[PDB]
């Protein structure tokens, strides 16, 4: 009949069949269930949508049109949960948060 | 000419659908691709290890849901299981 995507069926933008293929040839299990790629497309849209919202908010506060990795650094370093998730990762041209010790400030 | 096969256009479409006006650089696309891939083998390795734990030769939504609960801390776990449960539920109705 008419071809219809599982992403279109489930209301997902991320490709369910492609992440399904990466689960098949990713050497993780000999069999794979139907709902796991839909679940992964959902959680990856959550993660990308959330940190892109934080990056877009940082860009709108800085008044830039274009998302720069500095905005991504300011997005993920300013959240405790993202810092717990992404503590051991470096980001290309991210830099650091503006942070000094209060004692280093003069009297 | 070698089918590099990245995730750039899907991050582009989600970025357009939730931010209709913001611009974007290709370096941030490289950052996004590296991030989504790193999360992918992390959560897939957790799902494989947990399926091998319970002598399960299949990966369905339950063990990989438990992997979501293990990896994502705080409110991320409950919001992610909400999005995933809604997605697989409305997908089941098709």
């Amino acid at each position, epitope marked *: 009949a008419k071809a219809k995507s599982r992403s279109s069926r489930a209301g997902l933008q991320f490709p369910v069949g492609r992440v399904h293929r990466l689960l098949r040839k990713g050497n993780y299990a000999e069999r794979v269930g139907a709902g796991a790629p839909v679940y992964m497309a959902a959680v990856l849209e959550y993660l990308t949508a*959330e940190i892109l*919202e934080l990056a877009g908010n940082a860009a709108r506060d800085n008044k830039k049109c274009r998302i720069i990795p500095r905005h991504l650094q300011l997005a993920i370093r*300013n*959240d*405790e*949960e993202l*810092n717990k998730l992404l503590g051991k990762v470096t980001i290309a041209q991210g830099g650091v*948060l503006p942070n000094i010790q209060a004692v280093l400030l003069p009297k | 000419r070698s089918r590099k096969e990245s995730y750039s256009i899907y991050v582009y479409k989600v970025l357009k659908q*939730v931010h209709p006006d913001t611009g974007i650089s290709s370096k941030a696309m490289g950052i996004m691709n590296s991030f989504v891939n790193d999360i992918f083998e992390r959560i897939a390795g957790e799902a494989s290890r947990l399926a091998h734990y319970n002598k399960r030769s299949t990966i369905t939504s339950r063990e990989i849901q438990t992997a979501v609960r293990l990896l994502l801390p*705080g*409110e*991320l776990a409950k*919001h992610a299981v*909400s999005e995933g449960t*809604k997605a697989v539920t409305k997908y089941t109705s098709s």
Partner: single-chain antibody
Amino acid sequence: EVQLQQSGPELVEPGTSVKMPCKASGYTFTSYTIQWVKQTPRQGLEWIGYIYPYNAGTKYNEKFKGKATLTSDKSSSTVYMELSSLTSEDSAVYYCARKSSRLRSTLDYWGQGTSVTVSDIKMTQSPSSMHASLGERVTITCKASQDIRSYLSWYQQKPWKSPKTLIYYATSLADGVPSRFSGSGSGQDFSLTINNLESDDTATYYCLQHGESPYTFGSGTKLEIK
């Protein structure tokens, strides 16, 4: 398990400055934003600002900028609201409540409310009041001015009591709430549908948006049962 302690009522002369705490327990203190909201009887609820104790980040409403000041103590898990140069039009009940840093999350738990007496986007709640028996439908409207990406939540407060969260992200239920409540709508039109009505359900209802930086409540709606 989660607790949000506050201080008692204050009898304060005009022109001074008052410090009050929002000691909380039962959760990881640095991982949650703490919001402050005041309650005036003639304008309803008015959001003030929020604090994020993981990095001490501040953000205030421009209507309350300068008057409002937030100081946080990480050691005792206690945050402090500071009102400076108290005028006559400050006598209100002040609430402090918790919200996660996630945009999908909303104000989940509330304090008891400190009643202090003194010696943009517009949100519209269309039906102001209604009368109903114990078993019929009821529909509340939360039409907004600008576009909100489903970043809306509903709250119910009893008189002289703390508000209780009902819905989050305008469609998904909170914790402990029964399935009688059901939210719908996206964009600018939002609605909440209640299946069955009980004697405890009569209260005042508000809908709050958080898709924009000024957090704006509706006008409110008093519900009457039987």
